[PDB]
Design a protein around this ligand. Structure first.
Ligand SMILES: [Cl-]
Ligand SMILES: [Cl-]
Ligand SMILES: [Cl-]
Ligand SMILES: [Cl-]
Ligand SMILES: [Cl-]
Ligand SMILES: [Cl-]
Ligand SMILES: [Cl-]
Ligand SMILES: [Cl-]
Ligand SMILES: [Cl-]
Ligand SMILES: [Cl-]
Ligand SMILES: [Cl-]
Ligand SMILES: [Cl-]
Ligand SMILES: [Cl-]
Ligand SMILES: [Cl-]
Ligand SMILES: [Cl-]
Ligand SMILES: [Cl-]
Ligand SMILES: [Cl-]
Ligand SMILES: [Cl-]
Ligand SMILES: [Cl-]
Ligand SMILES: [Cl-]
Ligand SMILES: [Cl-]
Ligand SMILES: [Cl-]
Ligand SMILES: [Cl-]
Ligand SMILES: [Cl-]
Ligand SMILES: [Cl-]
Ligand SMILES: [Mg+2]
Length: 469
């Protein structure tokens, strides 16, 4: 009698979401094992008939085989998450029909999946929205693929200025943020807190112009993106991910830049204790510690600003002591109406959350801002009540390798002389500490001080800055 067991070795079942997710992964591991055991080549495995036979053999081996499958699942936490979506899933319903949901709770130091939500109710809809369904990550792409890489490459710091002046995509369409064609210059913090699109567009254009190996970062975290030239990649264009995979990207940022591959199976043993499969940790430093810890500070303010999510308000009410843990996160609640995301981390855990409709029809404007935020506050509370210490009371902190530059608020660069209107200007004013992940920190102010912007923008920006001296 084969048994899928929780992490602690309490049997889930002999051979709901947990069962079919565990079984599917165990079948794939058994396929690999049996093909290797039977000395089946790479070439042989490409044969569709041979693959079909080995898939069936793997299934029957699990069914008949007496294997012990050890999972990463924390039974009490996963059970609490199932109770939470049963009790509070209705809070997602926003008047666009029944809203589906996927969540993955992941240990930041290991990539172990402690629990997940597959959907509203397996008995009514079996689609697994945690592991199976691929959806655009929307504006939750920006920290990983635009800002995080730009910081890591020493192309921006925490108080760098970006253009949010109106601009068009290559196809001539304006870059929009709800009904806004844009504003003017803004800090990285304001860009992230609001999830403005134009600054993220310019950041990714800067990476492309500089020939940065973005694919190198994203593939080290297990992402599959077919076309890296898509202008809207930071806004989730040209990318579709599972919740489990995308949670793994946020795991990397939360774990001071070190990726651990997500997993739900730790081990499969034969009845006699022969190891069929064992997960092997392969940590990768995807972002520098400086980059990851700078990004943690920025994503702390995304949540505390409450601009794009009510989460901190919701959680403070449910569980003020847990709200005082060091939450960081990023929304996908502003750019688009088919997929709403909230990614949350403390130093110990990351929780990914998606909501949407199976057929991709639009959610309400505020489904991500309020409904998903309230649901995820309930889910976080349920996890803590099941396992009081699991989120932890540790703080995210800047790595000592972070470089601190005194820069002008106005330019995000060090005070000095710039040519404006044909004349040398001494640029002074209010200064701020800007965090950098390079050696030398911020450069001296240049005329084109911002990420992105047209001549005309810079004429407008410098007119205001010169006005202020
Ligand atoms: Cl389940
Ligand atoms: Cl499933
Ligand atoms: Cl056999
Ligand atoms: Cl357990
Ligand atoms: Cl997955
Ligand atoms: Cl999608
Ligand atoms: Cl343009
Ligand atoms: Cl702000
Ligand atoms: Cl690339
Ligand atoms: Cl992917
Ligand atoms: Cl490319
Ligand atoms: Cl796995
Ligand atoms: Cl997995
Ligand atoms: Cl055996
Ligand atoms: Cl490092
Ligand atoms: Cl609020
Ligand atoms: Cl957002
Ligand atoms: Cl979005
Ligand atoms: Cl649907
Ligand atoms: Cl601490
Ligand atoms: Cl320093
Ligand atoms: Cl300095
Ligand atoms: Cl440098
Ligand atoms: Cl630029
Ligand atoms: Cl212009
Ligand atoms: Mg992958």
């Amino acid at each position: 009698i084969s048994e899928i067991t929780y992490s602690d070795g309490t049997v889930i079942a002999s051979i709901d979401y947990l069962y079919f997710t565990t079984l599917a992964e165990a079948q794939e591991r058994m396929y690999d094992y049996l093909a290797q055991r039977d000395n089946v080549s790479a070439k042989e495995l490409k044969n569709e008939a041979t693959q079909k036979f080995y898939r069936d053999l793997a299934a029957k081996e699990i069914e008949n085989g007496g294997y012990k499958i050890t999972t990463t699942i924390d039974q009490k936490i996963h059970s609490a998450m199932q109770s939470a979506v049963a009790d509070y899933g209705y809070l997602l319903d926003d008047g666009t029909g029944r809203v589906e949901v996927g969540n993955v709770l992941m240990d930041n130091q290991t990539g172990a999946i402690l629990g997940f939500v597959g959907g509203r109710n397996y008995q009514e809809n079996q689609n697994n929205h945690a592991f199976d369904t691929k959806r655009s990550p929307a504006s939750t792409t920006k920290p990983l693929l635009a800002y995080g890489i730009a910081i890591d490459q020493g192309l921006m710091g925490s108080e760098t200025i970006l253009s949010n002046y109106p601009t068009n995509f290559a196809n001539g369409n304006p870059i929009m943020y709800a009904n806004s064609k844009g504003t003017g210059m803004m800090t990285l913090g304001e860009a992230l807190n609001y999830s403005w699109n134009i600054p993220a567009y310019w950041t990714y254009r800067m990476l492309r112009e500089n020939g940065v190996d973005v694919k190198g970062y994203m593939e080290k975290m297990g992402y599959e993106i077919p076309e890296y030239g898509i202008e809207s990649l930071p806004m989730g264009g040209g990318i579709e991910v599972t919740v489990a995979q995308h949670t793994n990207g946020y795991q990397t940022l939360a774990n001071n830049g070190v990726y651990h591959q997500k997993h739900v199976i730790s081990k499969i043993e034969a009845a006699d204790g022969r190891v069929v499969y064992e997960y092997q940790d392969k940590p990768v430093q995807v972002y520098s510690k400086a980059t990851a810890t700078i990004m943690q500070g920025l994503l702390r303010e995304v949540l505390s600003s409450r601009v794009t999510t009510t989460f901190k308000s919701n959680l403070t009410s449910l569980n003020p002591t847990l709200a005082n843990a060091d939450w960081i996160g990023k929304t996908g609640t502003t750019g688009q109406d088919e997929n709403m995301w909230l990614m949350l981390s403390t130093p110990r855990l990351t929780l990914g959350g998606w909501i949407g409709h199976d057929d991709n029809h639009s959610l309400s404007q505020q489904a991500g801002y309020s409904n998903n935020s309230n649901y995820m506050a309930h889910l976080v509370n349920a996890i803590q009540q099941a396992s009081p210490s699991i989120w932890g009371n540790e703080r995210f902190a800047l790595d000592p390798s972070v470089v601190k530059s005194e820069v002008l608020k106005s330019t995000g660069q060090k005070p000095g002389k710039v040519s404006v209107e044909g004349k040398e200007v001494e640029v002074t004013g209010s200064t701020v500490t800007s965090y950098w992940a390079n050696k030398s920190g911020a450069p001296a102010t240049s005329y084109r001080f911002a990420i992105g912007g047209s001549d005309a923008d810079y004429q407008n920006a410098w007119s205001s800055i010169v006005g202020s001296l």
